[PDB]
Design a protein around this ligand. Structure first.
Ligand SMILES: Nc1ncnc2c1ncn2[C@@H]1O[C@H](COP(=O)(O)OP(=O)(O)OP(=O)(O)O)[C@@H](O)[C@H]1O
Lengths: 62, 119, 394, 49, 47, 105
């Protein structure tokens, strides 16, 4: 799972990012490692594309 | 040919039918004897249909194009609106064989009581 | 003779002397953060170097005068101090009005509309009547006509017979230039580059790139794929007023399909509004307004009882008004009305060269030909007759 | 009671092969069987002419 | 006073075409004589 | 859950009203510093016969186009929350994240 995540992220060396992503993406590994926390890890992120079709800088003094 | 816009059946003395096309609309007194076929086709305001002046061969092509999506899901054809002149008078010089005529005159037509057995 | 002709459309006051003063003057005031306290009058907007974020103090609410103050100041400016002069007999001011009025809007005229600029034949007549008069002048052999006054607040369908307004069969579908501009604003904003603040420059997009599609579904099927001939990706540059003061659609050669314009301008327009907004006139109720289109109304004019008058009506369709000049509007109206009209009747549509000043030209022709000794209502008559003479003549 | 009803399939182009109103001739002017139970001998021999 | 000569001409021409069409169709529907008719069969048709 | 029909009609009406708000569509501040009345002048005593009341066109005969509320393309679908039509799953997501039972536009 970590190698799959790394290839998806276009990287060769597995890092805590990939391990965290793999553990929290799989249904059963997250159940097994729910209590566990990983150093230099992170939670699953959200996409910022939602900002574009709601509000952006206007032509005012652009 | 054209989108039938209205039917006004005048013991029917006659039924007026308005056919709409891209080039205009026209109202026709339509020989109430073929109101039977008109009802047989369930045609009403909105549908695009043919009708033959010789025999009354009314043929329902389906609903008009502009009436599509009236129900976001509905089993219909939605044939495009005809572009030519509703009054379609054109000559047919096609030929037929004599044996074809004989065959056409061999067996009867209709389902009077059980004669439907011919289909 | 210093005669005068005036039109007071909600979008723009087309006024001036009868000596070809068709000059188009905006009929409202403006305010902006770049103009903290200066409330610019009708044409003073040109003094604004940065018209971004303008606020429109306009005296019109859905095509009807309201609050009477913007119009007051605009008139005191145009016809009072600078551009035109006020006089009891020189300025033969004729006024335009909506097709329906009441005692309060323009009939009650105590020192209002009867102020220092008077003359013998003050005319507050609908712009539709002036347009019909001009049409019959340039079309003498015609007996009747249907005027399509596609203005800012309405697109009125009004029949006429050389003088007579067929009030019984007139329609004013709620869709107008205001609704089109605001819908374009909202459509642009809730999809990209939220600029719905101003009825300004987006109004330019409303005029620069907007066009009526001959085949709406076909242009849509051409738009659903990127990089095609329809140019749905107009790529309209938004003016920042620091480098350019008016927007414009980039030439087809400068198109960047990825939207990554290295110039830094926000250009991510892909939607179909550029031809879906003009289509609101022909097939309303798509946005939500349960109303008929303008061809549907031109045909519902069949309600005109005399049958022999319908073939004369259908041959004199006049597509005036500011909104009538969209690329592809006249031919679309013609196509929509031709199929609905009987096959044996003749259809002839006419679009004035300048459908905005057409009413002003009709007023000019009214003034310079007749209506000085007859059809007259003077303040001297208003002082003696009050509201009676005004409603009697109009 | 097998629910596996045989279910043929084909395009509509195979059914519209025989429909062309403005290209077919009226065979009503040549039919004779239809006149046996509708039209009378006298109607055609004495009255119509 | 509203009148259109061209419209009257077109209506008259289409009415003439209409009458010609109905005459043609009426003459084309009664030109065929039965082979037996109806009295012949009713005569030969025993109980 | 699902929204009622009163809410959808109120949304439609308020959007149509915003479509004629000319002064400032969202925030009419832009600086605070014979006065006839509003359209009420005649809208309060609406007459009968030929007038702006009877001059309305009425319902059209052409059925409403099923166009998407997000991108403006044909929309064979309809959101269960507010009925706003959408074309694709991407459109439904962009709608739910911008318009829903909580938000209008
Ligand atoms: N070149 C153009 N392209 C597209 N639209 C245009 C163009 N020029 C003007 N318009 C539109 O025409 C409208 C102006 O209409 P006009 O001023 O003639 O109506 P009006 O006389 O004010 O009507 P009313 O009296 O009912 O308010 C504007 O809203 C504008 O959007």
């Amino acid at each position: 799972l970590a190698g799959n995540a790394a290839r998806d992220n276009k990287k060769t060396r597995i890092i805590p990012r990939h391990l965290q992503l793999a553990i929290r993406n799989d249904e059963e590994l997250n159940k097994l490692l729910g209590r566990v926390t990983i150093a230099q890890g992170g939670v699953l992120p959200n996409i910022q594309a939602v900002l574009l079709p709601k509000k952006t800088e206007s032509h005012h003094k652009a | 040919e054209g989108e039938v816009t209205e039917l006004t059946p005048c013991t029917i003395s006659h039924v007026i039918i308005g056919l709409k096309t891209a080039k205009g609309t026209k109202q026709l007194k339509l020989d109430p004897s073929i109101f039977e076929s008109l009802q047989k086709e369930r045609v009403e305001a909105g549908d695009v249909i043919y009708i033959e002046a010789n025999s009354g061969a009314v043929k329902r092509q389906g609903r008009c194009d502009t009436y599509a999506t009236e129900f976001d899901l509905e089993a219909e054809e939605y044939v495009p609106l005809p572009k030519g002149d509703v009054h379609k008078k054109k000559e047919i010089i096609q030929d037929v064989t004599l044996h074809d005529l004989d065959v056409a005159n061999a067996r009867p037509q209709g389902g009077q009581d059980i004669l439907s057995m011919m289909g | 003779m210093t005669t005068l002709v005036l039109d007071n459309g909600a979008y723009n006051a087309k006024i001036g002397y009868s000596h070809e003063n068709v000059s188009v003057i905006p009929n409202c005031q403006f305010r902006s953060k770049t103009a903290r306290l200066k409330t610019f009058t009708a044409n003073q907007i040109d003094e604004i170097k940065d018209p971004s974020g303008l606020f429109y103090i306009l005296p019109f609410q859905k095509g009807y005068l309201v609050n009477w103050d913007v119009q007051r100041q605009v008139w005191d400016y145009l016809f009072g101090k600078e551009m035109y002069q006020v006089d009891f007999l020189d300025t033969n001011i004729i006024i335009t009005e909506p097709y329906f009025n009441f005692t309060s809007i323009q009939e009650s005229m105590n020192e209002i509309l009867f102020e220092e600029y008077q003359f013998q034949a003050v005319l507050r007549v609908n712009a539709g009547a002036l347009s019909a008069h001009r049409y019959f002048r340039d079309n003498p052999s015609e007996l009747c006509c249907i005027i399509v006054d596609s203005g800012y607040s309405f697109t009125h369908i009004v029949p006429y017979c050389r003088s007579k307004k067929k009030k019984e069969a007139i329609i004013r579908i709620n869709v107008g230039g205001k609704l089109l501009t605001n819908h374009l604003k909202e459509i642009i904003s809730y999809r990209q580059l939220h600029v719905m603040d101003e009825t300004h420059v987006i109004n330019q997009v409303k005029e620069d790139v907007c066009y009526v599609s001959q085949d709406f579904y076909r242009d849509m099927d051409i738009a659903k794929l990127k990089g095609e001939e329809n140019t749905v990706m107009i790529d309209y540059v938004l003016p920042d007023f620091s480098t350019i003061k008016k927007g414009f659609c980039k030439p087809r050669e400068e198109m960047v399909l990825s939207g990554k314009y290295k110039s830094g301008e926000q250009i991510l327009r892909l939607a179909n509004e550029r031809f879906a907004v003009p289509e609101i006139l022909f097939n309303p109720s798509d946005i939500g307004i349960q109303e008929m289109g303008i061809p549907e109304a031109i045909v519902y004019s069949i309600q005109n009882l005399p049958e022999e008058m319908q073939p004369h009506f259908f041959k004199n369709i006049v597509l005036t008004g500011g909104n009538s000049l969209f690329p592809g509007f006249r031919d679309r109206v013609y196509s929509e009305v031709r199929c609905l009209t009987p096959t044996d009747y003749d259809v002839s549509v006419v679009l004035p060269e300048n459908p905005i000043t057409y009413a002003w030209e009709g007023g000019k022709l009214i003034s310079e030909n007749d209506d000085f000794e007859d059809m007259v209502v003077t303040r001297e008559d208003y002082e003696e007759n009050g509201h009676s003479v005004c409603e009697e003549k109009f | 009671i097998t629910p596996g009803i045989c279910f043929s399939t084909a395009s509509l182009v195979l059914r519209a092969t025989d429909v062309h109103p403005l290209q077919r001739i009226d065979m009503g002017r040549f039919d004779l069987i239809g006149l046996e139970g509708r039209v009378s001998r006298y109607e055609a021999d004495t009255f119509l002419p | 006073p509203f009148y259109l000569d061209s419209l009257e001409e077109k209506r008259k021409r289409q009415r003439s075409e209409r009458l010609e069409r109905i005459f043609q169709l009426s003459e084309a529907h009664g030109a065929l004589a039965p082979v037996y008719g109806t009295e012949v069969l009713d005569f030969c048709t025993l109980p | 859950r699902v929204l009622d029909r009163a809410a959808r009609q109120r949304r439609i009406n308020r959007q149509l009203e915003a479509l004629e708000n000319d002064n400032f569509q969202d925030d009419p501040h832009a600086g605070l510093p014979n006065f006839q009345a509003l359209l009420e002048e005649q809208n309060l005593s609406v007459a009968e016969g030929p007038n702006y009341l009877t001059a309305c066109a009425g319902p059209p005969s052409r059925p409403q186009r099923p166009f998407c509320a997000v991108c403006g393309f044909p929309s064979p679908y309809t959101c269960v929350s507010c009925g706003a039509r959408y074309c694709t799953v991407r459109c439904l997501g962009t709608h739910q994240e911008t318009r829903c039972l909580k938000w209008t536009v």
